[PDB]
């Protein structure tokens, strides 16, 4: 049965369950709904009583899957999310759930075209140059992507800025510049 | 600096999870809440901000979640002339009950090997006073030596005789590294160094620094103690320009220690059950034991050969790191000849006629040739017996047995084993005596006249006495 | 394999050793008395 | 709770994966809900790997495991003298409890360099070949190595029976408290052994630690360390102990099982990577203390069984490279009539004549030289007389003055006319003669340690008048 | 043991060569005791080559077994990871 | 400078598991944030396994890894002659940068079936035993195999020193540029070797590629391919190179380390399944090109250390299978006084006489037949005086030719003088002389022919053969010197 593979790949148990759910949701055109339902089911998962009952290794898997079953029926979820949770409970991968969740999340992180890109600087730079880099950077993108900037400030670079646009990486820092000049000085 | 927590303890391997500030590989970490100082050396980054470490002491009593502090450096040991006459362990603590070692500078036990432009090609013979060594495989000043042998053939006695002769003739800060050996031998050496005056407990004119990690230590301590001793010697060579002697006993243990953790570090075994990193670990350790243009290090390393193999990966890998191998044989020790040096298996890179002189070289090659011919004739002697040999061949066998006995020598350190007195034969006396035996100048003397004598005048006196008795 | 017979031990290496020792203790006796 | 208490995740082959137990230490003793005990060997993120000290038939998935808070330790003291205990110190001789006031960890560290001193006092085995050519001193590790049914346990039991002459006297410096550790043996073999020891009245000063073949692998792994702690009690209180590990091959096998079931990766012959450490950290605890520490000692006699004479195997090579000397027992020698079948050409004692009385030193030098020269030419009759003089009946260990006497009667010429098949006969008669009439001479040689010219001449007349009468 | 078998093979190949040469020398000198020596050394060389063939078979078996045992040790150590 | 990157997921034992790097190629060189280099050996679905060209204490989890977009390449050219370099071609002798213009990938494929011509030209070593009995041709791969300390590096170094006579001359067709790759040796051993080559003035036409024992396993693994590319530069441009891998056992060990740490399935002796592929693709690059491709050549002299003479080990088996012959060295022959300790019965050259000059062919056919007969009857020494006159003659000629093959270290002989000495030997002119003198004679006679007989030596050198005038003149010289010899 041919799959609908997501644009980015995640590997492991998290990646397999997330890819299975992404493929199942794309066949029925229910991706956004399943996304919202996994966000909610993960925040349910982080409940302390619920976390204590789900991580417990001596609880029989029968009672545990019945508990997840009724506590999903208390939410009125899609059949896709309900079947996902029952598949995770039946296989004993409930501990990976949030991981799976975030995997699916990060999958759709690129489905909306949201490109993650972090700009490390020496000292926290103000918003004017930030909108400047907003505009000059969204030139780096293909059809229809939007920036996710996370302006980090480590002064150990003492100048310039290191820009990580997705997997592209430009080093405008002054430390690499001066070290490159020094290596040319010694070599 | 950074603080993490123990998450796993399997044997001598400990996993530590750092939330902030993962330490580099080879950093030393201190475990918090322990009676004595326990150090863990980082070996791997496992991902998920967890590091795998090797413990330098025992891991009993460790608890998951116990706090671990990052020191920010590898193991740093005190270096300087204050270490002379002291005993330190792998992490630089004084283990002689004589108080702290107040040096003014500390050195990390992990460093880079000297570069290629820092090498020196000078080859100068180091006369030991031992007949077989100086004759067939002489040592050089600033060279790496290596003494190969199975269990019980005399590596320790030979290294202690070398200590005796050279170190008391030397003027340049010896260093002894006991690497995974018997503690009884450590106490013995310490005391025969105190009574020898080489270590002075008062009026600090000591000239030996001792570093000890013995058989009862975990694998990590036995794998790093050679580096600790090496670092002491390296400070003496670099920051003081002195000429250092470096005795290491036993260096095989270093390699073996790696094996004992290899699989627990998650590594597929290579051949004979050795770590996949045997050759490169040996390389990065041994390439630091070297003479540079800044100073000199003569190093004598006792190398255990398991089961008298010499083809085992550990001795076989060690062979290419040495300048003058001395291979001790059990077949020779069972003849009663000591030291049990194998003449047809020992090698020296200064056994060159342009270095030792054509007379020395020609005598050495003649001795080796007559011993090989004796080997070849012994089969014929086994079948046809002795009476059916040629006359030239009976002469060969006679001179060969005499040369075998004359390579033997009584040691000053073996005075209890033999009852004999120590003899230290000069170089020209050795060349002259062996030339005279090869020439036929002593065909009339018996062969027991050459057993355990010094110069050839002693062989003559012994023959005269052995006759005057009977 | 030059000393293969006596490096192997066994009857042919031990008999060789005994023969050599016999001959040379004889010769050492007839060499000492002539001194 | 899940910090002082855990729950069994899975149980099988004597390994329990336990949930919780967050505060448990490495090598701590835990207790299952059935009354069984275990040791925490693998601290992993999600579970603890507990080795069960018993039968895992009674442990079920879901059982409760509690902490003891104590790293494994055994009772020690003198109350254990005369008792037969299992690896954890519980008595199995059916005589009630051992009233021990002290408990001592089984995995303690060996003494360092400073607390020791050279091995000087002799450990008398009562076996002429041992006491003469491969002598043992108090504080030494002497390996008894051989194939099956060559006579290793015999040597150990002769050694234990010999110390009765010293233990019933007065001078507390010559008393030796023996400890026999039976590892992986058949239980009826140990009953036979305790019978031989009780009949000879040797059990009053002996402890028997018994981890027999049906005991769990953790118990057989742990029994040598329990015996070593029971001996270190004596070693640290100015007393002298002797411990026999019979044998360490089976302890290594038990450790290999225990490790392979904990899913630790196998090394050579599936043995774990640190089996050398397993035996070295144990045999380094046999030591001689300096007078600041009481001057007590612990002598170790490990036993190793080789397969078809392969001393080149893994475990024999390990233990040969650890110890201070080996007694080699061969089957070829055993069937030729040489009993105890000690191969002197291979038997080494790295302590040597330092561990010997002066009288025996004198006579045994001559015996060693004559026996070497005889092993060369195989005078021939003198060597035959002496080799028949080395032979000895089982469970008949001799005093040192009588050994000196017979070595003398064989080494000064007083047997060179007698018939070989009569030598043994002569021997025993001779001894009876002396021990019937010449208690003055023997008390003299014993108290003096050496043989004066007065004693030399006295036993001259003794042996001369006897050999005339015989 | 492979090293035992190699030592013994070397020793017996040497004995074979020595007896072969002694036979040739005796068959030269045979141009009653010399013929007896010739046959004795011929039989000694025959027996030596017989023993050499048996020992070569044993040697090959033992070296194949040693290679397989080491492979199995490596494979078992790798499968435990 | 916009670069595609990844993160180090984990690091240990010189292996970095790296996230990202979605477009990196197999065997592509990457650069860590520390400045260290690496090579992408495992491309896996979720990580890339990078081998680190250096010390992994500089690499931490989370470090940025950049691509370079290029397979590993090294500088090639003549600017490398006289230099000591590392595995990636950086100068390590402190004499400044390598001013090369051309770069060449270290993993190029060997020439095919058609670009080759038969190996027909001699590669003179200067060792009498090699040049006469185990001849090497230009384009051949001759293995130097032996135990430790048996004289293998000395054979390589004599072969390197010998080429000075051809490299100082004007015949461009006979010049041989040498390359010595040192894998896993001490740096002091390499410094002694470089000093020996400088004293012999052999550095001006030699490259020394040095990946020593303290260098990371990837560098030792890569050093033979770097050296082979440096020599392929000459092989492609009509010139002739010789390369000595000293030794390939250590390169196999380094590759096994890298493979075992990358969790590749181990095989016999824990070596990976493609260690044969390793050495074979290294050694098939030594070729002889036809004139349509410039006529150049590359001769390979790999070195292999056997353990206890065991040529049935895994890596010796592989490299003996790959090469065109072997020079086997014995330690028993070494200590018998036979030095170079070449075992002539075991040594072989499957090129053979096609790699000899006609003069050496003349004398060497005779010498080979005579030493073979000697080897057959050689056991009968110790008794030979009790055999035929023919057998005693075989033994006599055999020992004379044996002593004629001994040679001093660092003293390679020209082919004309080798031919003259073998002529004196296999023509009978040494039977009346007793063995203890042969070497001595061989020396004095040599001086004689060098001093007063440059015409005959020059004429043999120019002709390649011993013609009848040459033959008779040699006859006269030999008999005169012999009759007048002490
Ligand atoms: N000195 C001796 N004189 C006579 N008999 C002896 C002597 N030593 C041993 N034996 C006998 O030879 C046999 C060997 O048994 P022993 O237990 O002493 O050796 P072992 O190596 O421990 O064998 P096992 O594999 O059973 O442990 C015993 O029957 C013993 O009685
Ligand atoms: N033709 C020769 N004559 C005299 N000595 C020689 C000769 N060839 C080599 N030697 C000496 O034999 C010794 C070993 O030679 P060499 O180091 O070249 O061999 P090797 O196999 O490369 O040793 P290694 O295992 O260290 O690599 C050297 O000391 C060398 O000087
Ligand atoms: N030079 C020697 N003279 C006399 N005996 C020796 C000598 N060397 C070794 N021995 C004997 O061999 C025994 C073992 O010696 P040792 O130094 O411990 O060798 P190793 O360190 O290799 O185990 C010594 O106790 C001694 O009896
Ligand atoms: Mg020693
Ligand atoms: Mg027994
Ligand atoms: Mg070499």
Give just the sign of the alpha carbon dihedral F121, F125, F126, F129: negative
Q: Confirm or reject: Cβ of D153 under 6 Å from ligand 1.
A: yes
Ligand 4 mean position, distance from CA B178 (Å): 10
Residue closest to B107 by CA, chosen among B70, B79, B73? B79
CATH of the domain at D173: 3.40.50.300
Write out the two tokens for D240: 């002298």
What positions of D carry a catalytic annotation? 350
**Rounded CA gap, D179 and F27, in Å?**
63
**Rounded CA gap, B29 and B21, in Å?**
13
Peptide bond into F218 cis (omega under 30): no
What domain range is B59 assigned to?
3-75
Q: At what angle do helices B219-238 and B251-262 cross, to 10 degrees?
A: 140
Min CA distance, C21 vs chain D (Å)? 6
**Rounded CA gap, B151 and F105, in Å?**
50
Neighbours of chain C (3+ CB pairs under 8 A): B, D, E
Residue closest to B232 by CA, chosen among B293, B175, B190, B300? B175
The values of phi and psi at residue B291, to 5°, are -80, 130
3-state SS, residue B43: strand
**Rounded CA gap, D65 and F187, in Å?**
58
- Among residues B50, B75, B100, the one where a domain terminates is B75
Residue having the nearest C-alpha atom to atom 17 of ligand 1? D153
Q: Going by C-beta distance under 8 Å and a sequence separation of 6 or more, which residues neighbour residue D99? A: D79
Peptide bond into F458 cis (omega under 30): no
How far from E21 is each of B57, D205, E9, E17, E42, CA to CA, in Å? 65, 67, 18, 6, 10
Are the Cβ atoms of B276 and F12 closer than 8 angstroms? Answer: no
Distinct helix (H) and strand (E) counts, chain F = 15, 16
Residue F32's DSSP bridge partners are F65
- Among residues B348, B383, B404, the one where a domain terminates is B348
Binding residue positions of D for Mg(2+): 153, 246
How far from F292 is each of B351, D444, E4, F113, F138, CA to CA, in Å? 50, 103, 57, 13, 17
* Proximal ligand: closest to the CA of B249: 4
Alpha-helical regions (H) of B76-145: 131-136
**Rounded CA gap, B19 and B21, in Å?**
7
* Proximal ligand: closest to the CA of B351: 2
Residue closest to B418 by CA, chosen among B337, B363, B342? B337
Judge if B120 and B221 occupy the same domain. Answer: yes
CA E20, E26, E30, E35: dihedral to nearest 10 degrees? -80
Q: Going by C-beta distance under 8 Å and a sequence separation of 6 or more, which residues neighbour residue D274? A: B11, B12, B219, B260, B261
Residue having the nearest C-alpha atom to atom 26 of ligand 2? F149
Are the Cβ atoms of B152 and D268 closer than 8 angstroms? Answer: no
Report whether B422 contacts B410 (CB < 8 A). yes
Q: Confirm or reject: Cβ of D321 under 6 Å from ligand 3.
A: no
Report whether F245 contacts F301 (CB < 8 A). yes
Tokens 């020193």 belong to: F161
Q: Going by C-beta distance under 8 Å and a sequence separation of 6 or more, which residues neighbour residue E41? A: E19, E20, E22, E23, E26
Beta strands at D206-211 and D73-76: parallel, antiparallel or unpaired: unpaired
Residue having the nearest C-alpha atom to atom 25 of ligand 1? D148
Report whether B65 contacts B33 (CB < 8 A). no
The values of phi and psi at residue A58, to 5°, are -95, -5
**Rounded CA gap, A25 and B376, in Å?**
85
Helix or strand holding residue B149 (H, E): strand B147-149
Q: Going by C-beta distance under 8 Å and a sequence separation of 6 or more, which residues neighbour residue F435? A: F399, F400, F403
Ligand 3 mean position, distance from CA B403 (Å): 21
Tokens 């995974």 belong to: B180
Report whether D284 contacts D214 (CB < 8 A). no
Helix or strand holding residue F72 (H, E): none
Q: Confirm or reject: Cβ of B68 under 6 Å from ligand 3.
A: no
Q: What angle do CA D110, D259, D315 make, to 5 degrees?
A: 60
**Rounded CA gap, D248 and B370, in Å?**
46
CA atoms within 13 A on the CB side of B139: 24
Q: Going by C-beta distance under 8 Å and a sequence separation of 6 or more, which residues neighbour residue B364? A: B135, B136, B351, B356
Count the residues in chain B. Answer: 470
Q: What angle do CA F388, F391, F394 make, to 5 degrees?
A: 150
How far from F325 is each of F117, F126, F252, F276, F312, CA to CA, in Å? 18, 18, 20, 17, 16
Write out the two tokens for F340: 């170079």
Give just the sign of the alpha carbon dihedral B214, B218, B224, B228: negative
Residue D6's DSSP bridge partners are D20, D65
C-alpha of F219 from chain center? 20
CA-only gyration radius of chain A, Å: 22
Q: Going by C-beta distance under 8 Å and a sequence separation of 6 or more, which residues neighbour residue F423? A: F363, F466, F474, F478
Breaks (C–N over 2.5 Å) after residues, chain E: 31
The values of phi and psi at residue B104, to 5°, are -100, -5
**Rounded CA gap, D40 and F459, in Å?**
87
Quick check: is F350 catalytic? yes
Number of Cβ within 10 Å of residue C29's Cβ equals 12
Q: Going by C-beta distance under 8 Å and a sequence separation of 6 or more, which residues neighbour residue A34? A: A21, A25, A78, A80, A81, A104
From the number of C-beta atoms within 10 Å of its C-beta (0-12, 13-18, 19+), residue D14 rates as buried
Query: Is B138 inside any structural domain?
Result: yes
Residue having the nearest C-alpha atom to atom 7 of ligand 3? B154
Write out the two tokens for F473: 């003149």
Judge if B60 and B127 occupy the same domain. Answer: no
When scoring D311, D336, D375, D377 by the number of chain C Cβ atoms within 10 A, the one with the most, hence best to mutate, is: D377
Ligand 2 mean position, distance from CA D78 (Å): 65
**Rounded CA gap, F13 and B45, in Å?**
10
CATH of the domain at A76: 1.10.520.20
Residue F203's DSSP bridge partners are none
Residue closest to D261 by CA, chosen among D11, D2, D4? D11
What domain range is F304 assigned to?
74-359
Judge if B87 and B156 occupy the same domain. Answer: yes
- Which residues on C lie below 8 Å from D378 (Cβ)? 14, 18
Write out the two tokens for D190: 């140990």
**Nearest CB neighbour to C16, from listed B372, B378, B446:** B378
Q: Which of D131, D143, D152, D154 to mutate to test the pocket of ligand 1 (most atoms within 8 A of CB)?
A: D154
Query: Is B353 inside any structural domain?
Result: no
**Rounded CA gap, B337 and B450, in Å?**
11
Residue D301's DSSP bridge partners are D244
Residue closest to B92 by CA, chosen among B108, B71, B114, B111? B108
Helix or strand holding residue A37 (H, E): helix A31-45
Report whether F250 contacts F221 (CB < 8 A). no
**Rounded CA gap, F202 and F210, in Å?**
17
Chains B and E touch (3+ CB pairs under 8 A): yes
Judge if B251 and B271 occupy the same domain. Answer: yes
Count the residues in chain E. Answer: 81
Min CA distance, E5 vs chain D (Å)? 13
Q: Going by C-beta distance under 8 Å and a sequence separation of 6 or more, which residues neighbour residue F245? A: F181, F183, F224, F227, F251, F282, F300, F301, F302, F303
Q: Give the 3-state secondary structure of F3-17.
A: EEEEEEEEEECCEEE
The residue in chain F having the minimum alpha-carbon distance to the alpha carbon of residue E67 is F268
- Among candidate residues F17, F339, F350, F400, the one labeled active-site is F350
Write out the two tokens for D323: 């110890």
3-state SS, residue A118: strand
**Rounded CA gap, B354 and F195, in Å?**
15
Residue F178's DSSP bridge partners are F206, F242
- Which residues on F lie below 8 Å from B297 (Cβ)? none
C-alpha of F151 from chain center? 13
Report whether F340 contacts F157 (CB < 8 A). no
Report whether D85 contacts D95 (CB < 8 A). no
Write out the two tokens for F396: 């006599």
CATH of the domain at B66: 2.40.10.170
Query: Is B470 inside any structural domain?
Result: no
Number of Cβ within 10 Å of residue D117's Cβ equals 20
Residue having the nearest C-alpha atom to atom 26 of ligand 1? D149
Report whether B231 contacts B107 (CB < 8 A). yes
C-alpha of B36 from chain center? 30
Q: Give the 3-state secondary structure of D243-261.
A: EEEECHHHHHHHHHHHHHH
- Which residues on D lie below 8 Å from E70 (Cβ)? none
Q: Is E70 on the interface with B (CB under 8 A)?
A: yes
Q: Give residues whose Cβ lies within 5 Å of ion ligand 4.
A: B 156
3-state SS, residue F360: helix
Helix or strand holding residue B392 (H, E): helix B391-407
3-state SS, residue A21: helix
User: DSSP of E22-81, one letter per residue?
Assistant: HHHHHHHHT--HHHHHHHHHHHHHHHHHHHHHHHHHHHHHHHHHHHHHHHHHHHHHHHT-
Number of Cβ within 10 Å of residue A102's Cβ equals 17
Judge if B99 and B65 occupy the same domain. Answer: no
Report whether F363 contacts F386 (CB < 8 A). no
Write out the two tokens for B82: 């204050």
Chains F and A touch (3+ CB pairs under 8 A): yes
What domain range is A60 assigned to?
12-110
Judge if B63 and B138 occupy the same domain. Answer: no
Judge if B35 and B170 occupy the same domain. Answer: no
Give just the sign of the alpha carbon dihedral D347, D348, D351, D352: positive
**Rounded CA gap, B46 and F15, in Å?**
11
Report whether B119 contacts B296 (CB < 8 A). no
C-alpha of D326 from chain center? 12
Helix or strand holding residue F20 (H, E): strand F15-20
Neighbours of chain D (3+ CB pairs under 8 A): A, B, C, E
**Rounded CA gap, B340 and B335, in Å?**
9
CA D400, D404, D409, D411: dihedral to nearest 10 degrees? 140
Write out the two tokens for D252: 């290594």
State in Å, rounded, how far the first CA of chain B is from the last one: 80
Query: Is B297 inside any structural domain?
Result: yes
Q: Confirm or reject: Cβ of D397 under 6 Å from ligand 1.
A: no
Asked whether residue B253 is marked as a ligand-binding residue, the answer is no
Tokens 């000697």 belong to: F374
* DSSP 8-state class, residue B24: P
Residue having the nearest C-alpha atom to atom 15 of ligand 2? F151
Q: Give the 3-state secondary structure of chain D.
A: CCCCEEEEEEEECCEEEEEECCCCECCEEEEECCCCEEEEEEECCCCEEEEECCCHHHCCCCCEEEEEEEECEEEECCCCCCCEECCCCCECCCCCCCCCCEEEECCCCCCCCCCECCCCCECCCCCHHHHHHCCCECCCECEEEECCCCCHHHHHHHHHHHCHHHHCCCCCCCCCEEEEEEECCCHHHHHHHHHHHHHCCCHHHEEEEEECCCCCHHHHHHHHHHHHHHHHHHHCCCCEEEEEEECHHHHHHHHHHHHHHCCCCCCHHHCCCCHHHHHHHHHCCCCEECHHHCCCEEEEEEEEECCCCCCCCHHHHHHHHHCCEEEEECHHHHHCCCCCCECCCCCEECCHHHHCCHHHHHHHHHHHHHHHHHHHCCCHHHHHHHHHHHCCCCCCCCCHHHHHHHHHHHHCCCCCCCCHHHHHHHHHHHHHHHHHHCHHHHHHHHHHCCCCHHHHHHHHHHHHHHHHHC
Asked whether residue B156 is marked as a ligand-binding residue, the answer is yes
Residue closest to F265 by CA, chosen among F253, F275, F254? F275
- Which residues on E lie below 8 Å from D268 (Cβ)? 73
Distinct helix (H) and strand (E) counts, chain C = 2, 0
What domain range is E55 assigned to?
1-24+41-81
**Rounded CA gap, C33 and D21, in Å?**
85
Residue D25's DSSP bridge partners are B63
Q: Confirm or reject: Cβ of B339 under 6 Å from ligand 3.
A: yes
Neighbours of chain B (3+ CB pairs under 8 A): C, D, E, F
The values of phi and psi at residue B453, to 5°, are -125, 170
Strand (E) positions, F306-433?
325-329, 348-349
Count the residues in chain D. Answer: 470
């Amino acid at each position: 049965a041919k799959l609908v593979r997501p644009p980015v790949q995640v590997y492991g148990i998290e990646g397999r369950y997330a890819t299975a759910l992404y493929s199942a949701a794309s066949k029925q055109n229910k991706l956004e709904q399943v996304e919202k339902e996994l966000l909610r089911v993960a925040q349910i998962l982080k409940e302390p009583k619920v976390a204590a009952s789900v991580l417990n290794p001596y609880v029989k898997r029968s009672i545990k899957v019945k508990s997840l079953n009724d506590i999903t029926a208390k939410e009125r979820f899609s059949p896709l999310t309900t079947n996902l949770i029952n598949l995770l409970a039946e296989n004993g991968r409930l501990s990976n759930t949030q991981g799976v969740v975030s995997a699916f999340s990060t999958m759709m992180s690129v489905h909306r075209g949201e490109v993650p890109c972090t700009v490390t600087s020496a000292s926290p730079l103000e918003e004017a140059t930030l909108s400047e880099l907003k505009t000059v950077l969204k030139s780096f993108l293909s059809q229809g992507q939007v920036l996710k900037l996370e302006a980090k400030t480590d002064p150990s670079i003492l100048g310039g800025m290191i820009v990580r646009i997705g997997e592209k990486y430009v080093d405008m820092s002054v430390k690499t510049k001066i070290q490159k000049l020094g290596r040319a000085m010694r070599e | 600096a950074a603080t993490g927590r123990i998450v796993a303890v399997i044997g001598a391997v400990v996993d530590v999870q750092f939330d902030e500030g993962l330490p580099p590989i080879l950093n030393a970490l201190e475990v918090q809440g322990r009676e004595t100082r326990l150090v863990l050396e980082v070996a791997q980054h496992l991902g998920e901000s967890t590091v795998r470490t090797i413990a330098m002491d025992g891991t009993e009593g460790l608890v998951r979640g116990q706090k671990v502090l990052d020191s920010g450096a590898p193991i740093k040991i005190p270096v300087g002339p204050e270490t002379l006459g002291r005993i330190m362990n792998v992490i630089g603590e004084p283990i002689d009950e004589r108080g702290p070692i107040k040096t003014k500078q500390f050195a990390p036990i992990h460093a880079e090997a000297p570069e290629f432009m820092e090498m020196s090609v000078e080859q100068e013979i180091l006369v030991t006073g031992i007949k077989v060594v100086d004759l067939l495989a002489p040592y050089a000043k600033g060279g790496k030596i290596g003494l190969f042998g199975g269990a019980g053939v005399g590596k320790t006695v030979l290294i202690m005789e070398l200590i005796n002769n050279v170190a008391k003739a030397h003027g340049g800060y010896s260093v002894f590294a006991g690497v995974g050996e018997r503690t009884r031998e450590g106490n013995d050496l310490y005391h025969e160094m105190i009574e020898s005056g080489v270590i002075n407990l008062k009026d600090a004119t000591s000239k030996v620094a001792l570093v000890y990690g013995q058989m009862n230590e975990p694998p990590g301590a036995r794998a790093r103690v050679a580096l600790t001793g090496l670092t002491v010697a390296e400070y003496f060579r670099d920051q003081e320009g002195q000429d250092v002697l470096l005795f290491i006993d036993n260096i095989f243990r270093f390699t073996q220690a790696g094996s004992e953790v290899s699989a627990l570090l998650g590594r597929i075994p290579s051949a004979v059950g050795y770590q996949p990193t045997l050759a490169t670990d040996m390389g990065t350790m041994q390439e630091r034991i070297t003479t540079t243009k800044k100073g000199s290090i003569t190093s004598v390393q006792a190398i255990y050969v398991p089961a008298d193999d010499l083809t085992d990966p550990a001795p076989a890998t060690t062979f290419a790191h040495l300048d003058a191998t001395t291979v001790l044989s059990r077949a020779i020790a069972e003849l009663g000849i000591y030291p049990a040096v194998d003449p047809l298996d020992s090698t020296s890179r200064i056994m060159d006629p342009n270095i030792v002189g054509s007379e020395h070289y020609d005598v050495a090659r003649g001795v080796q040739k007559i011993l090989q011919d004796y080997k070849s004739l012994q089969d014929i002697i086994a079948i046809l017996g002795m009476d059916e040999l040629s006359e030239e061949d009976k002469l060969t066998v006679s001179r060969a047995r005499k040369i075998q006995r004359f390579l033997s020598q009584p040691f000053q350190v073996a005075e209890v084993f033999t009852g004999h007195m120590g003899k230290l034969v000069p170089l020209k006396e050795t060349i002259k005596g062996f030339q005279q035996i090869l020439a036929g100048e002593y065909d009339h003397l018996p062969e027991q006249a050459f057993y355990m004598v010094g110069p050839i005048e002693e062989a003559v006196a012994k023959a005269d006495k052995l006759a005057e008795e009977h | 394999g030059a000393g293969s017979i006596r490096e192997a031990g066994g009857a042919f290496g031990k008999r060789e050793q005994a023969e050599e020792e016999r001959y040379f203790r004889a010769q050492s006796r007839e060499q000492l008395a002539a001194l | 709770d899940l910090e002082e208490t855990g729950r069994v995740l899975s149980i099988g082959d004597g390994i329990a994966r336990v949930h919780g137990l967050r505060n448990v230490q490495a090598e701590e003793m835990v207790e299952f809900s059935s009354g069984l005990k275990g040791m925490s060997l693998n601290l992993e993120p999600d579970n603890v790997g507990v080795v069960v000290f018993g039968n895992d038939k009674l442990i079920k998935e879901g059982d409760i495991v509690k902490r003891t808070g104590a790293i494994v330790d055994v009772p020690v003291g003198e109350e254990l003298l005369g008792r037969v205990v299992d690896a954890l110190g519980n008595a199995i001789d059916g005589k009630g409890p051992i009233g021990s006031k002290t408990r001592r960890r089984v995995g303690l560290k060996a003494p360092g360099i400073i607390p020791r001193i050279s091995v000087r006092e002799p450990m008398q085995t009562g076996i002429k070949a041992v006491d003469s050519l491969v002598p043992i001193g108090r504080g030494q590790r002497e390996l008894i190595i051989g194939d099956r049914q060559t006579g290793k346990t015999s040597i150990a039991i002769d050694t234990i029976i010999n110390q009765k002459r010293f233990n019933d006297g007065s001078d507390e410096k010559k008393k030796l408290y023996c400890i026999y550790v039976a590892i992986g043996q058949k239980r009826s073999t140990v009953a036979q052994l305790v019978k031989r020891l009780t009949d000879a009245d040797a059990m009053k000063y002996t402890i028997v630690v018994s981890a027999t073949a049906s005991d769990a692998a953790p118990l057989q792994y742990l029994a040598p360390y329990s015996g070593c702690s029971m001996g270190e009690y004596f070693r640290d209180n100015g007393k002298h102990a002797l411990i026999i590990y019979d044998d360490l091959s089976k302890q290594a096998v038990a450790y290999r099982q225990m490790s392979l079931l904990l899913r630790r990766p196998p090394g050579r012959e599936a043995y774990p990577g640190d089996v050398f450490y397993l035996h070295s950290r144990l045999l380094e605890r046999a030591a001689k203390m300096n007078d600041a520490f009481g001057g007590g000692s612990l002598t170790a006699l490990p036993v190793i069984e080789t397969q078809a004479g392969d001393v080149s195997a893994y475990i024999p090579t390990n233990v040969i490279s650890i110890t201070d000397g080996q007694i080699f027992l061969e089957t070829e020698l055993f069937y030729k009539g040489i009993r105890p079948a000690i191969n002197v050409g291979l038997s080494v004692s790295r302590v040597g004549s330092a561990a010997q009385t002066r009288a025996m030193k004198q006579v045994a030098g001559t015996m060693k030289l004559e026996l070497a020269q005889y092993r060369e030419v195989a005078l021939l009759s003198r060597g035959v007389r002496l080799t028949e003089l080395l032979k000895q009946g089982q469970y008949s260990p001799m005093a040192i003055e009588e050994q000196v006497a017979v070595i003398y009667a064989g080494v000064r010429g007083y047997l060179d006319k007698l018939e070989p098949s009569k030598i043994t006969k002569f021997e025993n008669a001779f001894l009876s003669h002396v021990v019937s009439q010449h208690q003055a001479l023997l008390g003299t040689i014993r108290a003096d340690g050496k043989i004066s010219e007065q004693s030399d001449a006295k036993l001259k007349e003794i042996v001369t008048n006897f050999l005339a009468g015989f | 043991t492979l090293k035992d078998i190699t030592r013994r093979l070397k020793s017996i190949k040497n004995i074979q060569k020595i007896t072969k040469s002694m036979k040739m020398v005796a068959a030269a000198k045979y141009a009653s005791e010399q013929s007896a020596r010739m046959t004795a050394m011929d039989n000694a060389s025959k027996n030596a080559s017989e023993m050499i063939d048996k020992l070569t078979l044993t040697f090959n078996r033992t070296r194949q077994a040693v290679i397989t045992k080491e492979l199995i040790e490596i494979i078992s150590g790798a499968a435990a990871l």
